[PDB]
Design an enzyme around this catalytic site. Structure first.
Site, mmCIF file in Angstrom:
data_model
loop_
_atom_site.group_PDB
_atom_site.id
_atom_site.type_symbol
_atom_site.label_atom_id
_atom_site.label_comp_id
_atom_site.label_asym_id
_atom_site.label_seq_id
_atom_site.Cartn_x
_atom_site.Cartn_y
_atom_site.Cartn_z
ATOM 1 N N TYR A 29 31.706 43.865 50.012
ATOM 2 C CA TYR A 29 32.566 42.834 49.484
ATOM 3 C C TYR A 29 34.004 43.243 49.706
ATOM 4 O O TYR A 29 34.375 44.389 49.449
ATOM 5 C CB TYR A 29 32.342 42.648 47.988
ATOM 6 C CG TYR A 29 33.353 41.711 47.326
ATOM 7 C CD1 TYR A 29 33.282 40.339 47.523
ATOM 8 C CD2 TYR A 29 34.371 42.203 46.509
ATOM 9 C CE1 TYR A 29 34.174 39.470 46.918
ATOM 10 C CE2 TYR A 29 35.282 41.348 45.894
ATOM 11 C CZ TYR A 29 35.177 39.973 46.103
ATOM 12 O OH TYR A 29 36.070 39.101 45.505
ATOM 13 N N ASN A 44 37.764 41.711 48.687
ATOM 14 C CA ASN A 44 38.735 40.815 48.083
ATOM 15 C C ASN A 44 40.047 40.997 48.865
ATOM 16 O O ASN A 44 40.783 41.919 48.583
ATOM 17 C CB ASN A 44 38.883 41.191 46.592
ATOM 18 C CG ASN A 44 39.705 40.174 45.786
ATOM 19 O OD1 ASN A 44 40.143 39.153 46.316
ATOM 20 N ND2 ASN A 44 39.921 40.467 44.497
ATOM 21 N N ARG A 91 36.417 26.804 46.720
ATOM 22 C CA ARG A 91 36.224 26.472 45.323
ATOM 23 C C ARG A 91 37.478 26.680 44.498
ATOM 24 O O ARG A 91 38.436 27.296 44.947
ATOM 25 C CB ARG A 91 35.081 27.301 44.745
ATOM 26 C CG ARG A 91 35.340 28.777 44.819
ATOM 27 C CD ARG A 91 34.062 29.564 44.896
ATOM 28 N NE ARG A 91 34.305 30.887 45.465
ATOM 29 C CZ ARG A 91 34.511 31.110 46.761
ATOM 30 N NH1 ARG A 91 34.498 30.100 47.635
ATOM 31 N NH2 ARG A 91 34.737 32.339 47.178
ATOM 32 N N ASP A 117 38.016 28.416 40.859
ATOM 33 C CA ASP A 117 37.454 29.110 39.728
ATOM 34 C C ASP A 117 38.357 28.876 38.554
ATOM 35 O O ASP A 117 39.577 28.954 38.672
ATOM 36 C CB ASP A 117 37.366 30.611 39.998
ATOM 37 C CG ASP A 117 36.457 30.940 41.146
ATOM 38 O OD1 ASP A 117 35.520 30.157 41.392
ATOM 39 O OD2 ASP A 117 36.679 31.986 41.787
ATOM 40 N N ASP A 123 36.314 37.302 50.259
ATOM 41 C CA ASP A 123 37.070 36.305 49.519
ATOM 42 C C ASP A 123 38.539 36.311 49.931
ATOM 43 O O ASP A 123 39.170 37.366 50.070
ATOM 44 C CB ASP A 123 36.994 36.569 48.007
ATOM 45 C CG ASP A 123 35.823 35.867 47.328
ATOM 46 O OD1 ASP A 123 35.168 35.021 47.965
ATOM 47 O OD2 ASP A 123 35.570 36.171 46.137
#
Lengths: 118, 118
Positions: free
Chosen positions: A33, A35, A79, A81, A112
């Protein structure tokens, strides 16, 4: 949807439960992952530990997805959040693009790009 | 320099200690830290926990400060931090501007603008 776009959308649904243990079931052992532009969290252990640490200072109160797509193997989705900092109770709306890589119905890559404007 | 730039430069030197307790003594009780554009860490306890939390996954191996100045009562300084992620050993150079607010020789406000390019 594609079988991979479907998986991503269940994961997106799952986020609001703020449950790192629930969430890591979507991820393969060989996974990461990132960020952006921060350095990645490498391996399944780290992503979990990353979700957990995130779930101790924030609750995801809502995810509104407004786009899903795919090109060259990767699922693209966008999206907002609704984030609630737990030690304050203040809520924040932030946009983010999620770029997923999947191998055999499990997440092997996740990047992300949160909105980082002032 | 000004007495205020002096305090900030010492704090900047103290960073490489990777030690939150050492660092936290520069901050007043009424204070905040904001890693832009993230929501601020409110109050001295929260700034402490934020550093400690940062010092579990990164070491600050080096601060190279290349600018310090002041306008409107606020100290501005610019550095490159050499960051080493503890779970990997990989090193990274990133620049960041530090904006400081002090009251009676203690930090009451700190905002970071890290270089956030891809």
């Amino acid at each position: 949807s594609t079988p991979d776009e479907k998986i991503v959308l269940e994961f997106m649904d799952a986020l609001t439960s703020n449950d790192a243990a629930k969430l890591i079931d979507y991820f393969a052992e060989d996974t990461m992952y990132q960020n952006m532009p921060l350095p990645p969290a490498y391996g399944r252990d780290a992503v979990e530990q990353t979700l957990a640490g995130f779930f101790k200072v924030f609750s995801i109160d809502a995810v509104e997805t407004f786009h899903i797509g795919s090109t060259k193997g990767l699922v693209y989705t966008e999206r907002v959040d609704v984030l609630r900092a737990l030690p304050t109770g203040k809520s924040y709306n932030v946009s983010v693009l999620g770029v997923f890589q999947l191998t055999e119905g499990k997440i092997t890559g996740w990047r992300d790009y949160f909105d980082l404007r002032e």
